[PDB]
Amino acid sequence: LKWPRDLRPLAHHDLLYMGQISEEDRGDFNATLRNFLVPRVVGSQKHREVREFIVRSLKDLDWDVEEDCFDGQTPHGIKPFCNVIATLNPSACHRLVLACHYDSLLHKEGTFIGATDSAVPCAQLLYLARSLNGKLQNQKTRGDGLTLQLVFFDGEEAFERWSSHDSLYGSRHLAQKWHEDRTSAERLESCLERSEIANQIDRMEVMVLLDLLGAENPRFYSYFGETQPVYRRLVNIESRLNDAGLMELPRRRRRTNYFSNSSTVGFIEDDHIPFLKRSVPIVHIIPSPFPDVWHTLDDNEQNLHHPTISNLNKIFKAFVSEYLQL
Questions:
Q1: Annotated active-site positions, please?
Q2: Is 47 annotated as a binding residue?
Q3: Is 181:278 a contact under the CB 8 Å cutoff?
Q4: Glycosylated at which positions?
C-alpha cells in the first residue's frame, strides 16, 4: 500500500539550505544540549528542571505545550511521571510526530548522564523546532491539515530489571490515553480524503522515535515494512547530502552510510511499542548495535561524537523540511 501522503522530493536549493550548519548553529545546539547533560532520574529536582526547560523552550516558540502527568506504581513505589507533548498546530488533523525520552536511568553503579540516552535526541528535537521556527510558523498558516508534534516521553527506563510492567511508563500511559480519547475527521482541520480517524492515536501519521544517538558512526536499518517509504527518504536525503559535500568526515572523499538500505530482524523495546500495538506507523532511529557506552557510566558528554551529531542534524532538518514541504 502506498504511503497516505504523496512524498514530494526536496528541491536541490532546499536540500543545500537545510544541509548548512553555521558556527552559530553549532553554538546553539551545544548550548541547548548542555541543559540535558545532567542526571535526570524520575523523582528528582534536575528531572523537574529538564521538564520545565523543554516546556519553556517550546512555549517561547509559540507551540501548544501539554503535560501528561500521572502517578504510577513502580518497583521503587509510587512515582510521578510527566510526558511533554508540543504541537505546532493543534487543530491540524495529521501530525508528523518526532519523539524521544527525557528521563535518565537510575544506575546502581553511580551517577549516570545518559548523553546518547537520550540527552542528544532531546536537544535535537528542540534544535529542530528552534532552527526551523520561521519556516514552521509559515507552514502552520497553510491550512493543509499537517503539522509537527514533539513528544518527550517520561519513564522510558526500568527502575530495576527490565519488564513489561517496569519500563515505558510514559509511552504506555500516553498511548492508552490517546486511544481512549475519541474524535473524528469532522472535528478536525483538513484530514486527508480517505482517513480513518476514531481517536487521537489515529492522528499520529508516523512516529519517528530517536534514541541512543550521538555516538560515532551509528548504523540504522528499516525496522518496519509499514514505514519503508518514509525510511527510504532518510536514505535518500543522507545520500544527497553526501553528494553535495555537506557531511563532516575525517578524510576527503568519504561518505556517511548511517541509514542502511536494508532491513534487519531485531526486536527493540522502546517507547514506540505501545503505539506499534495500536498500529501507529513507526520509524525507529536507533543504532544497531547500541553504542558501546550503553547503560554504562561512560555514556557521557566526552564520548559524544560531534561531527556525527552535526551530520544527523542535517539529515533530520532536511527530512522535516521534505515531509512538511517547508
A1: 156, 211
A2: no
A3: no
A4: 30, 261
For residue 72, what is its C-alpha cell?
A: 504510577
The cell numbers describing 310, all together, are 552535526
Is 13 labelled as part of a ligand binding site? no
Contact 93, 189 (CB under 8 A): yes
- Experimental technique for the deposited model: X-ray
**For the chain, how many structural domains are there in total?**
1
Q: Using alpha carbons, list the distances in angstroms from residue 233 to 7, 73, 222, 259, 318.
A: 9, 40, 11, 10, 10
Resolution in angstrom units: 1.6
For residue 136, report the phi and psi dihedrals to the nearest 5 degrees. -65, -40
Q: What is the 3-state secondary structure (H, E, C) of 123-174?
A: HHHHHHHHHCHHHHHHHHCCCCCEEEEEEEECCCCCCCCCCCCCCCHHHHHH
CA–CA distance, 6 with 28 (Å, rounded to integer): 33
Cβ–Cβ < 8 Å for 316, 131: no
Identify the domain containing residue 207 by its residue range.
1-326
Residues 245 and 234: their CA atoms lie apart, in Å, by: 17
